[PDB]
């Protein structure tokens, strides 16, 4: 179904989470097809987006546009607070989020949970220039469930939690108890940033996500969005919430983001787009503002 | 262009976005003409309502057109005081006209659409938006806007909106002479807003439009972008250019404005905050 039976080497991203639409990509090579204990895993060499990671038929990243997601999900929370030291990432992807967290020189510890070792192994083999992400000596990789890991975490441990999840299908990561777990694992005024889907496609799912966060997190609660051409509807959003404690202002950065530089310039994130990301269209704005 | 990758699905293929296509499941085909100018399809889509297509390229869908039509219209029109005379190049489905008509200081809306079939299709298959054409201030010309514009009285217009297709004879709308034509027909400090493609797919083309624009318009020259799921890459952008004359600040609207679904003063400003890869190139 996802691979065209009509004309060779077209992949089409079909889902009932985005009914009646597919982003089709010309595929040169499948580099990897694989079935873990959790999910179907495909990597292809696309004609125009470089390498593409697909889990359960859903595009997770392309080399060409991953920067828009990976820089926004990392820098929106981490540039909003001073001197973040301890960070938790839920979901490993290709390591590109870890690479973004590691630009922040105040960070000392990056704990990351990925349930599926196949996803880690696939990152290291097929996406090695971004999967160096995993090798930063600050990084502590747990192959295990992130929901359990967070129940089990010491209270008040983290400056920041980044929830780099797939779609709510994964469904527990969008619910009140998981958020209560996050609230408890954050230091007072610690921040969470989560994958919060498409304003065009899932207004109903997002209204509930913001209601749960408004209830659990007593600091700040904001919603941001970014252009990601190879996500469905060409955009995805983020919950930014702070726990009870010091003032947090997600709307502007505190901080802009070594002799030997390990990173290229930011490709997408900057201090102006940080603010712009919180200016929603009128159809979305009405709802999310309460 | 129909069932080219999936049976029952429209796929938007073009060497303007190599290696990719947006695919929409088609409930039914509503129209199929071949005017003296382009191949015209309207189809009823599964989930984006009615869809207009010219030469295999998506012009609009009922579900997301608000994001294009409200931004190409209100970014220019909310950046100046009491616009009275307005020229639109391109008719689409009358959506842009409907949005221009929200501005109560506007007296005259000249619009050029070379292809009459586009207009007839709009009124027939998109009637609730095609009302844009019916408003008493609208002066509809079935003719070449390039020609209409070179034939205009110098300094006549407060604003021109270029709601063009892709730079594919449409390519004239992207070149110095047409830009000189506009700079001329605008009053001093008058503004133009142009369809200016995707920062993800067309940085080269955009760079050339900006540079061209910066030679001609001696007021402000700015680029803005917006989410449109059914345009290639999911975003489209706009040149905003003011002619020599009173200062225009496109990032800070001077005024506020069947309700608006997308545009608002906050998104007005955010529309000029480009990603770092675009922001460097587009600035100097």
Residue numbers in the entry:
A (entry chain B): 42 to 210, 213 to 300, 305 to 337
B (entry chain A): 43 to 210, 212 to 300, 311 to 337
Provide the publication's sentences verbatim.
Longer polyamines are produced by aminopropyltransferases (APTs), enzymes that catalyze the transfer of an aminopropyl group from decarboxylated S-adenosylmethionine (dc-SAM), a universal cofactor of APTs, to a polyamine substrate. AtSPDS1 and AtSPDS2 share the fold of polyamine biosynthesis proteins with the characteristic two-domain topology. The active site of AtSPDS is formed between the N-terminal and C-terminal domains.
The structures of apo AtSPDS1 and AtSPDS2 present the PEG molecules (absorbed from the crystallization solution) bound within the active site. Additional β strand (Ser46-Ile48) is formed only in chain H of AtSPDS2 (one of the eight chains in the asymmetric unit) creating three-stranded β-sheet at the N-terminus. One subunit of the AtSPDS2 (chain H) presents the state, where no ligand is bound in the active site in neither the cofactor binding compartment nor in the polyamine groove. The conformation of this chain stands out from the others and presents the possible open conformation of the active site. Comparison of the chain H of AtSPDS2 in the open conformation with chain A of the AtSPDS1-CHA complex shows that the AtSPDS adopts two significantly different conformations. Therefore, the negatively charged active site is uncovered and ready to incorporate cofactor and substrate.
